[PDB]
Write a structure and sequence with these properties.
Chains A, B: Keywords: Signal. The structure is a homodimer. By secondary structure, the first copy, chain A, is mainly alpha-helical. Chain A has one domain. Helices cover about 55% and strands about 5% of the residues of chain A. Chain A is built from 6 helices and 2 strands. At the A-B interface, α2 and α4 of A face α2 and α5 of B. The structure holds dysprosium ion (7 copies). One dysprosium ion (DY) binds next to loops of chain A.
């Protein structure tokens, strides 16, 4: 998916950008959408192609093999900062289409 | 409620315990249940009696006046650890009934 696609689906206010509240909420929706096994936890197989082993090492600090909702969203907030090249707390289409923005996109859209 | 009543509410027996995945999932449901204004954000008036000013200062690091889901759940994970007096990763009824356990209960049930 592209940045224009994400704005079309996830932006409901009268702007051209995704703010952190919009991004976190879409991350929470996506967590459930990519979790087909009927639990409340993401296992490593469920996160392939969206998260790296380094993301798990950084965010999963509780000794389990499960990403709970908060550990997933922690990674997303870090990725938001990396994509927000002009520091204004808003992700525009150009920021979403950048390499760092692609990392946000894979956590906010199935 | 009490620890026993909280365990019963989550379809568990009186001598059972809560682990972090069930607690985080219940915290995520509670976030939305205590948020009656149609947004995706908890304002301070929505968290009175559940969170302190110091909780907001620790968890709300983004310069806004709003708790997103990840900031709320960060506080819950901190409270789980404080209520887990023996640090075994499980909260018994007695741990839930403690003063620190009360702080978990106000975040996992309306
Ligand atoms: Dy917006
Ligand atoms: Dy799963
Ligand atoms: Dy975990
Ligand atoms: Dy920006
Ligand atoms: Dy609200
Ligand atoms: Dy915030
Ligand atoms: Dy314990």
């Amino acid at each position: 998916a592209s940045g224009a696609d994400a704005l079309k689906a996830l932006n409901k206010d009268n702007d051209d950008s995704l703010e952190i509240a919009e991004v976190i909420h879409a991350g929470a929706t996506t967590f459930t959408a990519i979790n087909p096994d009927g639990d409340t936890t993401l296992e490593s197989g469920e996160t392939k192609g969206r998260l790296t082993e380094k993301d798990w090492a950084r965010a999963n600090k509780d000794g389990d093999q499960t990403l709970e909702m908060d550990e997933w969203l922690k990674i997303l907030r870090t990725r938001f900062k990396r994509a927000d090249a002009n520091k204004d707390g808003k992700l525009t289409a150009a920021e979403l289409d950048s390499k760092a923005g692609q990392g946000v996109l894979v956590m906010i859209m199935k």
